[PDB]
Amino acid sequence: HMVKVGYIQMEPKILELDKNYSKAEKLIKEASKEGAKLVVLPELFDTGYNFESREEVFDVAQQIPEGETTTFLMELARELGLYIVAGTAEKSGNYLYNSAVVVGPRGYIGKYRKIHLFYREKVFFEPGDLGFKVFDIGFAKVGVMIAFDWFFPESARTLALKGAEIIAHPANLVMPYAPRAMPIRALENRVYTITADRVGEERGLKFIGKSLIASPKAEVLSIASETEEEIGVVEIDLNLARNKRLNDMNDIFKDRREEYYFR
């Protein structure tokens, strides 16, 4: 029930897939040496974010799972004996999705397509259509959401109600709020959250860094710099997430009264 998990805070270079693979590899190898068994990369780590046209992203985006990003991550996950959740631009026929892939030693585990698109993403990407999924990685059940999904408390709630013990959260954050909000998402659901943000400025848009890992008690177990590429790895206690008792008398999920919600 104790396991080491981490974020990889990196600076994707827009449209330079090979360079971004190399950077991810370097940092993930560092995280593996610290003992991480699950690592999370940022939203759109492979392509970058701040596109000018649909064409330029459509021309580089890879299919999941046959394409280059997924195959790269598979090789790395098997080499290092760990699980990776990573944000990537997904080409599916004529459509692009803002996706996250989950890989492990056995290969491709599954994917998530961003349900709540943010700002100009609606110009490039189709809204996600697979719902909120929880993946079994043996030592834990891991839910995935991407960036702006944090804003909707229903995102994490749905993952937690489906049995997520850890929420892996690839992100490219631009608003100042997520670092204050994510510990509340962790607290209200009694889960661990791993927000992996990028850094840098990209065609005029500044990302905020501040990747963080939050506990079921709203503790910030690790928080990154605003500007620097870095990893954060911490040991988490999965029993703290499986036990929904806030105190002796209140189990948070048994205390929900659905008949009074949304009505």
Added chain:
Amino acid sequence: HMVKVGYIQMEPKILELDKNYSKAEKLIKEASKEGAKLVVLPELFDTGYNFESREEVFDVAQQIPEGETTTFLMELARELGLYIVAGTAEKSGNYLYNSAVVVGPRGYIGKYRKIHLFYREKVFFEPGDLGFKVFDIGFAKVGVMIAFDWFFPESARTLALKGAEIIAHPANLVMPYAPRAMPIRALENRVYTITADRVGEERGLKFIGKSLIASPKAEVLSIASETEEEIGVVEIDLNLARNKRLNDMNDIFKDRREEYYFR
């Protein structure tokens, strides 16, 4: 559009209804002079909180709206021409509810019964059975929730989806979290929140104070001390709560995708 609202942070003395009325009156008179048109009093401001048995509270609890607490609040609201949301122990036949009463210049408006009971409340009180209600007070729609209701993101979400522009939140807080959480509840629903907490130690139980008013942008507009009785009144812009645009391409409520939540 622009209106002044406030919290009253007081220290109820357990079982001393008349003393608590006098204290509330004093502080609400101060809030009226500052221009408040809506004031929120703490959870169970009339009875206090940390009961030793159900009998002790059953013996002082008042009916709503015929009982002493509601009639007191009605007299005060008429005299000062304002709206009051206040936490009170409700006697309803043979049952006790941990309730909030809404009154205005013309009299009794309605009530709310705490849906999510916290810790030893379960020993004294029946779980609320009226659902989450929004009350029309002319210049605004006010939703009400009580104390531990904050922990469940569905509480504020249900109020906001029913049209709440302000969430009045009587509370007796003992955990450290709500002052960090309330701005996120405001932000995610684009509403104002007024958390009126008590202070003091009562039979060994310490309340945290820190009453606060939060904006749709997660700004703490006013926050009280840990220990002192005080008021806080601020001018809020109700158009910032009515307009759910986060930015020029994302409207928070139009961006919700219910088909993917809880399933």
